[PDB]
Design a protein around this ligand. Sequence first.
Ligand SMILES: [Mn+2]
Ligand SMILES: [Mn+2]
Lengths: 199, 199
Amino acid sequence: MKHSLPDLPYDYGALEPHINAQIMQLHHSKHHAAFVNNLNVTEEKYQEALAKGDVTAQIALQPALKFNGGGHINHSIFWTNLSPNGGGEPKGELLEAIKRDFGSFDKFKEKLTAASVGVQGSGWGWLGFNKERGHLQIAACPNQDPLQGTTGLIPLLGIDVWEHAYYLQYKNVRPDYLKAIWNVINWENVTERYMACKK
Amino acid sequence: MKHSLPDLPYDYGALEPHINAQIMQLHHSKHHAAFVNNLNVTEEKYQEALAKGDVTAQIALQPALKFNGGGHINHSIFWTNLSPNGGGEPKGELLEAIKRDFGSFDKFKEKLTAASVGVQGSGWGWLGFNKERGHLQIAACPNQDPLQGTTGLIPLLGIDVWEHAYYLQYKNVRPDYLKAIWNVINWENVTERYMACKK
Ligand SMILES: [Mn+2]
Ligand SMILES: [Mn+2]
């Protein structure tokens, strides 16, 4: 099957001034690319280990698969969660669910901002949908550990709090990056992911 | 290639009074049996997930693969690490290496006992060989995480401090179990594993 780097849905500068073109080009063409090439190499090594029944090799390969595999899963979602036409607030059933589960859109923003700022080290913040409980849920993931693979929650909106996503523009001030990114959230995509969870 | 439950190399009662027949039969015919079978189920799933390129499914299967795969790796070694012909002290180059790297055989016993008592929760203690440094090394692993797959060290002697290995006989007093097991260590097997590392 072989994983492939998806095209970005917009120009590298489409999210200016909130995320500059240099970050988008680096974050997409270098970081994400590395997560795909090394993921493909690791998957191929696993195929060899499985055919030989080498369980030691399978277990030794798990960290590279989760790190590079999670990186591929996460970034692919992140690009679609943003848009030059984004920002503002969602509408319809998604906004109703946000108000029901978090009180209000503003309170939801505070909680997701807090979870994203609260990641110590590298990782991600996610708004997800809990299919079994039938409601929204916020979770944090370290490094590149993907939400669904490690928690079962279906990802709706991810924020890449890695330093390579903002450090060139905002330096150490991650909160300024988190505030700015709300202006480019593609709520149309987040809604599609939400409606896909429900029948 | 399908993994198979190995026969025990001795009678269930061959290690009495140090480890009773009820433990050997349970620890082998129930616990290990579950690991091997569940490992095969997980491998078949992971093969299916790998062929589809489903990285989320692969990552969700990692805990079962490490737990059951490690269980198969560890226990298969553990049975060979014990023998009715065991006990006493090793000889030859392995004894020389123990004295060189740990000071004395008694000092090695103290270090491995300390590592085994020090496991908080379920896990194992291992004497291994570091191929890159060319010397022995003691390490502890949680749950069923295997030594080589998680550390690169080649396993020589493993001690199962899991509560299901001694609780029927020694209850909470793990040190009594650790004291007894030294009488049945198959140093011939440990020597073979050590000599297999050197060429
Ligand atoms: Mn990233
Ligand atoms: Mn056991």
